[PDB]
Amino acid sequence: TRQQYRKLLKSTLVLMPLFGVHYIVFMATPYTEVSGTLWQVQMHYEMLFNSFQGFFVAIIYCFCNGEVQAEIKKSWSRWTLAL
Amino acid sequence: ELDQLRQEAEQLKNQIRDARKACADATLSQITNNIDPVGRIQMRTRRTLRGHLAKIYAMHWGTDSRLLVSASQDGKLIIWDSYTTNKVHAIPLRSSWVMTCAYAPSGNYVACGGLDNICSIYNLKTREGNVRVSRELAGHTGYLSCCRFLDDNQIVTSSGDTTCALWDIETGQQTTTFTGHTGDVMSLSLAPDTRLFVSGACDASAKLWDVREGMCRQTFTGHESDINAICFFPNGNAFATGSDDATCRLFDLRADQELMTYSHDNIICGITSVSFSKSGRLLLAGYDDFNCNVWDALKADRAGVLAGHDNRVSCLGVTDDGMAVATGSWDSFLKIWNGSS
Amino acid sequence: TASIAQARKLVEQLKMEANIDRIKVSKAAADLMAYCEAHAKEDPLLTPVPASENPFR
Amino acid sequence: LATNYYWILVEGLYLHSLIFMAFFSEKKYLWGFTVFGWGLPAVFVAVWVSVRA
Amino acid sequence: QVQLQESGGGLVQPGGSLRLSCAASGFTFSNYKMNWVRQAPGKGLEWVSDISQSGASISYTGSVKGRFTISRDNAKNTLYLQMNSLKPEDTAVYYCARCPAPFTRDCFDVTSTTYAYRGQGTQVTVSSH
Amino acid sequence: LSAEDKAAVERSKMIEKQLQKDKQVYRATHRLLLLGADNSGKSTIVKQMRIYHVTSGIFETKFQVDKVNFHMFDVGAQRDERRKWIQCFNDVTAIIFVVDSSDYNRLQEALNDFKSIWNNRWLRTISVILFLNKQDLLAEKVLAGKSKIEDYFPEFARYTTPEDATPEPGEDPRVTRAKYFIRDEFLRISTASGDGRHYCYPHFTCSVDTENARRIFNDCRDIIQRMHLRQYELL
């Protein structure tokens, strides 16, 4: 069904930053000369995704986590009611 | 033969209703208008007790308001110290499914029961320090729902077969049997002087039983759904009952009718446990919506709300001196709440 | 049969319940009012206790 | 850098263990994963440092 | 006191029509889900039909679908079962039952021997004469 | 003062070590609840699972397969009313619901019981393992033809065998059509409300079959794996 494919693709995307799948693209590349297209694209590719991997992981698994959101909502509501 | 008896019963029921209406001089809320409101009450969690594996189903305070007994569905019966949080005993129960637990006024014995229909009593007087099953009682066909201690030798027990029993510990046999319910008896409360006890069942009615005579005295029918909790007034001339209809009702023995109902439009969940305070002014009823509400017994106003539980508040207890209130939920946590100035 | 026995038991229970002494609501309520007023000063919940005598610090 | 890479592996291994294993021992596996994530990279850095020096 | 009264019944020729009335007092009719139960001579209780709080959801057992019509009236606090195309096998004692809990979709022990939230019921006999 | 507190703490820590050990075993085992009317052969299943050796009230049976322990609980001596004592079973791994597919007349009662269990407010996360017991009796009755299922379920006339069904080559097409119709009826209730919170696993079971334990083990493994995936918001 279309829904099953949608959930599988969504599940794959969320798990990708956690498992470091983006590392596999340029894993086996040996030392290439600096003045080269492959070297330039690799450095830009890795220095972008590697840097932002932590940001994506934090968003997905802590900020977007259902339990964290529910816990924050309860604490804020109780604090506001007490205040 | 059946018609002539049913019609007589209907005529009698009408007579009781007429008698109730005749004595309805006024309404409790009407005469409490000239009373200063209790006001907002803020209670903070002072002690958090953890260590139970499964959900907490019932608990009971001690006479000295120091040691409390808690029962969990995992098969553990832990005795906690409310002050230092230390655990004194951890009884591995034979049957994992446990629905109630009792603490003897003397503190020498502790009772429990559950789906096994067996009321197990353990003695803490052993010199060796090793707990053991002092006595086992097997006379109930339905599930064991509640049990209260009269003394070191007499215990009042409630079961799910519409029967309440008065066991003798030394002999291990039922002394008196109460058979006047048409639904499962959920819980019962003991009067301060241990002469009469009330029982609430699934038939939306509460019955008053005499321990000695063994015969029902008064029947109250004012609820719309199953009655889950019931508790005596501190003075003993009234009792409060909680039901699944999201309403608490106060019944007066002398008036033989309900006095005032505590209900809120926003609340639509059931009620699991209810208990009075030392003075009886407050009504702390544990609701099904993951929190407990403290009502004013005279103004029917929500004095305060205790929301510190992750699941339904299965049980609730108040100390004899009323210093603190312990609430147990299905999150395997026991919270002790005390007021602050 | 069981049905007739149950009906007779219910009738007997109702007969016993009816023949009891009942006190008027106002008189029965006054006792509760007096009890609450007399013991108001001895209720820690109604009257918060100073932290020095409070055992839950 | 190495510990971050292995902790990603630890998370992947931990998820694989949960799905494909019917029994778990938190007291043992949790400490084992922590040692593997932290201790092993240190060994590789230590041997590299020793070789370099 | 929760009490339900059933009206209508008696001898009905097969293939005729009949109406069943269930009057409820002592609780909020609108809030509680309703149900109908029947007991054939020498058999046990069997669930017949159910209607939700607002009547937007209705269901029937296989032996009655398309023959009986269940409706509820909140203002008048009554529940109805319209019966037509009666057959000789449908003779039984019909009970008006209430799902025990409010604001709930389930109700477990409606078809129980000692249910305390059902009416006395009435006798219906589809016998040709 | 100091001695008493030290003794109290030492005892408290002594209880803690016991509870930790109890926590290890409690989590290790999987709790199961067995349900069904007596027309279903629940008792026979109990005897079959008793092979794996490890007023009356509830009974417990312990069986181990592939080094994982199950505790199956059955309520023999209990009142007919069950809206109250069914709430304490909200932490069990799964509920095994046994149905006698060969009763027809009492089949609707099983559907209602399954409907109540499935839609219960507290049993919203407990999966139900549906065992259509003693299919042999159903097969024999269908071949005999004396009793027609069409009378009890008028829809059966307009029913077609599912394409995804996998009947045995040596079994009558009538038998598979009847049993799969019963499976579809139960699954209609399962899918009416249950979408992703909990799932139902239909199975065709015979009283003498010894494969029931393996089916339960596989069903429990799927439930645990699905729960773990849900914790990561992947399913």
Next chain:
Amino acid sequence: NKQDLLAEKVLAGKSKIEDYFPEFARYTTPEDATPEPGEDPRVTRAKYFIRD
């Protein structure tokens, strides 16, 4: 045939054979009968009543 179903029905107790055969009440298990040690006396009583 299928004595297991009869044994299960007898153990369950919902259906009482006495209603269909009133003489079952005044029936006694034959002395010469040889029931299995691990089988309920009720099951042997019922099956031997049918056999008789």
Next chain:
Amino acid sequence: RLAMIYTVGYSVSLASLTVAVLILAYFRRLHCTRNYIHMHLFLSFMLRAVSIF
């Protein structure tokens, strides 16, 4: 150019992860073996970034 890209990306990750670590640590409900490894993974990202700086 590469220096500015990863320095910016690492800085945001540190800020996001630090809020994440504080959130997980403070709430007692979130305390679980899964969350402990998450905290370990989140930390490892932090030490990786600060050391690079």
